Amino acid sequence: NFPNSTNLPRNPSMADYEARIFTFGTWIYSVNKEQLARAGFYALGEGDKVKCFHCGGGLTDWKPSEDPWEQHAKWYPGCKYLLEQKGQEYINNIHLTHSLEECLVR
Ligand SMILES: Brc1cnn(C2CC[NH2+]CC2)c1
Ligand SMILES: [Zn+2]
């Protein structure tokens, strides 16, 4: 399933922060649910699998050191919600950071 790069959200029923927050319930996973929701994510109920309301992008297997906004930019860089909330400069930094993180050890 291709990522949504239009200015229109794929799941408008999940456009409000509060709506997204209800999807998690009791959340045992290593990444904060408030932080996930702020980054546009809602829970699917399949372990720690989340989806962005706007781009439709799915993310799974969260480690405690990982950041929702960073991961969002890493895997769904065409997301218009992401661009709205963070700006292109932030997004550029993240890409550069990760691409460089490769030629550090990898
Ligand atoms: Br595409 C995709 C699905 N999950 N992910 C990562 C999310 C953060 N944990 C490591 C995996 C990328
Ligand atoms: Zn998105």
From Swiss-Prot:
Q: Where are the BIR repeats?
A: 17-82
Can you summarize the PTM annotation of this record?
S-Nitrosylation down-regulates its E3 ubiquitin-protein ligase activity. Autoubiquitinated. Ubiquitinated by TRIM32; leading to proteasomal degradation.
Q: Which protein, by its recorded name, is this? A: E3 ubiquitin-protein ligase XIAP
> What tissues harbor this protein?
Expressed in colonic crypts (at protein level). Ubiquitous, except peripheral blood leukocytes.
> Cross-link Glycyl lysine isopeptide (Lys-Gly) (interchain with G-Cter in ubiquitin), residue numbers?
K74, K80
Task: Name the segments for region: Required for interaction with SEPTIN4 isoform ARTS.
Answer: 14-29
Lineage: superkingdom = Eukaryota
Q: How does it assemble?
A: Monomer, and homodimer. Part of a complex composed of SEPTIN4 isoform ARTS, XIAP and BCL2, within the complex interacts with SEPTIN4 isoform ARTS and BCL2, SEPTIN4 isoform ARTS acts as a scaffold protein and stabilizes the complex. Interacts (via BIR3 domain) with DIABLO/SMAC; the interaction inhibits apoptotic suppressor activity. Interacts with HTRA2/PRSS25; the interaction inhibits apoptotic suppressor activity. Interacts with TAB1/MAP3K7IP1 and AIFM1. Interaction with DIABLO/SMAC hinders binding of TAB1/MAP3K7IP1 and AIFM1. Interacts with TCF25 and COMMD1.
Family under the similarity heading? Belongs to the IAP family.
Reported impact of H95A = No effect on interaction with SEPTIN4 isoform ARTS
- What mutagenesis or variant effect is reported for W62A? No effect on interaction with SEPTIN4 isoform ARTS
Which positions bind Zn(2+)?
Answer: C52, C55, H72, C79
Q: Where in the cell is it found?
A: Cytoplasm; Nucleus
Task: Report residue spans for region: Required for interaction with DIABLO.
Answer: 81-102
Q: What does this protein do?
A: Multi-functional protein which regulates not only caspases and apoptosis, but also modulates inflammatory signaling and immunity, copper homeostasis, mitogenic kinase signaling, cell proliferation, as well as cell invasion and metastasis. Acts as a direct caspase inhibitor. Directly bind to the active site pocket of CASP3 and CASP7 and obstructs substrate entry. Inactivates CASP9 by keeping it in a monomeric, inactive state.
Q: Which disease is it linked to?
A: Lymphoproliferative syndrome, X-linked, 2: A rare immunodeficiency characterized by extreme susceptibility to infection with Epstein-Barr virus (EBV). Symptoms include severe or fatal mononucleosis, acquired hypogammaglobulinemia, pancytopenia and malignant lymphoma.
Comment block on domains: The first BIR domain is involved in interaction with TAB1/MAP3K7IP1 and is important for dimerization. The second BIR domain is sufficient to inhibit CASP3 and CASP7, while the third BIR is involved in CASP9 inhibition. The interactions with DIABLO/SMAC and HTRA2/PRSS25 are mediated by the second and third BIR domains.
Q: What is the effect of changing E66S?
A: Decreased interaction with DIABLO/SMAC and with HTRA2. Decreases interaction with HTRA2. No effect on interaction with SEPTIN4 isoform ARTS
What effect on the protein does mutating N11D have, as reported in its record? Reduced interaction with HTRA2
Query: Which species?
Result: Homo sapiens
